[PDB]
Amino acid sequence: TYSQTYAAWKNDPEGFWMEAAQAIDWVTPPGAALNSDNAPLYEWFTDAEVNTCFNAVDRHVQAGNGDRVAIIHDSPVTHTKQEITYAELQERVSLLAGALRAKGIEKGDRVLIYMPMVPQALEAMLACARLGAIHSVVFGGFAANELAVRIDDATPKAIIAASCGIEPGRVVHYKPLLDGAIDLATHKPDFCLIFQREQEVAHLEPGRDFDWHEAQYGVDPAECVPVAGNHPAYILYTSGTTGQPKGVLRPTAGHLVALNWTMKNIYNVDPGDVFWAASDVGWVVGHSYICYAPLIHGNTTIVFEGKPVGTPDAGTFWRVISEHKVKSFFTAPTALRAVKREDPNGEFIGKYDLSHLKTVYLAGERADPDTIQWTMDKLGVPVIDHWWQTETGWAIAANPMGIEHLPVKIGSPSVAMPGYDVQVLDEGGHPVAPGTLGAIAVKLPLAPGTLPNLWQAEERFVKSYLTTFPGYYETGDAGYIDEDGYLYIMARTDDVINVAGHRLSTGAMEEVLASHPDVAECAVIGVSDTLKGQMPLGFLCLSAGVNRPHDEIAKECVKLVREKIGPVAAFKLACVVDRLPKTRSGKILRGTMVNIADGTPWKMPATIDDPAILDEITEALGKLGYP
């Protein structure tokens, strides 16, 4: 039972994690789990030696499963289906690693990856892991400036990219965006590796850019390089301002142990089953559950290049699941809301044999009751909300379907996973009564596989995560826990919003808006949206002496966010106001504007400069349709 599992962890955490560590093939096995020598900066399995690519690929070939399918590429936007076995994947990754080594990549070097959803993206991640290089994958929906920030922070020796990708009605110009990002960056890579795609080919800068295939001619395959248990597996940037980059570090050994454990115990698949997360390699869901966890565990994983609707229609999810015999499906609530908007009766579902589909999982944003119940009703399988974040790399709260299918409380991601002692704390740092809203914190040490630190930013790591609640990790989410231990995730406690499942910094957006020549100051809030959960909304205050029309400035701002942050920011609603409501210390009362926009309750702020400002704000919101 799950109570037995969780109590077994509480009563003997070392024994629990050392046993889970037995599933990993070590070069040097760890002698213990927790390393508390640098508390409160805890680390796990630091004395191990291991290689991630060996456990995700080679080992399965050596076990006789070389002909098992490792990766299925299903790209409706290029009408392409490709299957790659574990033996084929071993050949591709070891030769690609050899090419990276021949051009100077060494253990510890960073390699940025800027690619759409193609199997070559996983091969690049795994090749870096094979060399002990440290990859950093950047979502292809980010703009050249955002890619430049990353280049500067991570100082990669190389960047791997594809020529293009396909979005509905638009080709994404990866290589031109990379070119502009490299020009913007102060740090310059030694070389780039460019995977050409026929939909829009790329220009190579001579001496810098090399063709993916040609660079592999005549190279020897590289071996799996042994790295320390606490060697970084990758750097994954999450929501932030250009001044305060948050490069989440993933430690190699805890990552292997924890992700492997989740595949049966949470996602209820056995080795050889087919698993599909409809996410992107640019996100942690794509790191953990497109690339690493299924391959570590010996599953088939699906790399899907398309959309829940429009590539070609709302049946695509069911066609993919049916055709490839998916057993567990992992997606985001926004994607299913799009499907049921187009196909409310689930007519596409009856067209396909879904008899292999056993469980659906949701994460990345609030899983609303309508979406849960529709999906349960139309698929007749359990639908499992579960909560986690870039920092943890795997579930904090879940329904542990491979251990015990617990009763689902619709609206809740269920219960704390082993390794997470989850508590709701008040302003004063004290646990509150069940059902009381507060900040969700996790008692240190955070579970194996979670971040030990931020890339070259230890001070920012301590401040943002370990300081508000000493002895705890501050998740950044607020919510409550009921009397049975079921979690409910409410809002972020910081500037972050979740748009269509995507974690975005509103502060990043304000910094961009604040650089428009005519804007004196601004505020970006996240308003409620039925389809996408939240949407960003901007308020603009012009400088003195601005005559220009208001909507024309608003357009240049919408366009500046798209150019500086990227299309993924989904920033379409900007408006112009005389002034912003502030407290005595000058803080902008963003929380009050949100409640006004959402038509939710609020109390007039107690230290607001001029209350009449909120009437002006209310008029600006009504012009945009809110509420």
Ligand SMILES: CC(C)(COP(=O)(O)OP(=O)(O)OC[C@H]1O[C@@H](n2cnc3c(N)ncnc32)[C@H](O)[C@@H]1OP(=O)(O)O)[C@@H](O)C(=O)NCCC(=O)NCCS
């Ligand atoms: C919202 C949804 C219906 C897609 O529709 P959408 O119009 O693309 O909505 P988004 O907010 O994602 O897209 C915003 C913009 O970024 C672009 N975008 C999305 N993904 C992109 C990508 N991989 N590369 C480049 N641009 C991308 C879109 O084209 C869009 O551009 P537009 O303004 O010119 O139309 C939904 O399927 C979705 O995005 N789910 C989450 C995706 C995911 O990977 N989630 C992981 C969480 S578990």
Ligand SMILES: Nc1ncnc2c1ncn2[C@@H]1O[C@H](COP(=O)(O)O)[C@@H](O)[C@H]1O
């Ligand atoms: N199951 C969930 N329910 C509600 N919010 C979630 C859930 N999963 C993830 N999130 C939100 O998304 C954040 C993680 O984003 P990311 O780091 O990009 O994966 C969390 O901190 C939450 O704010």
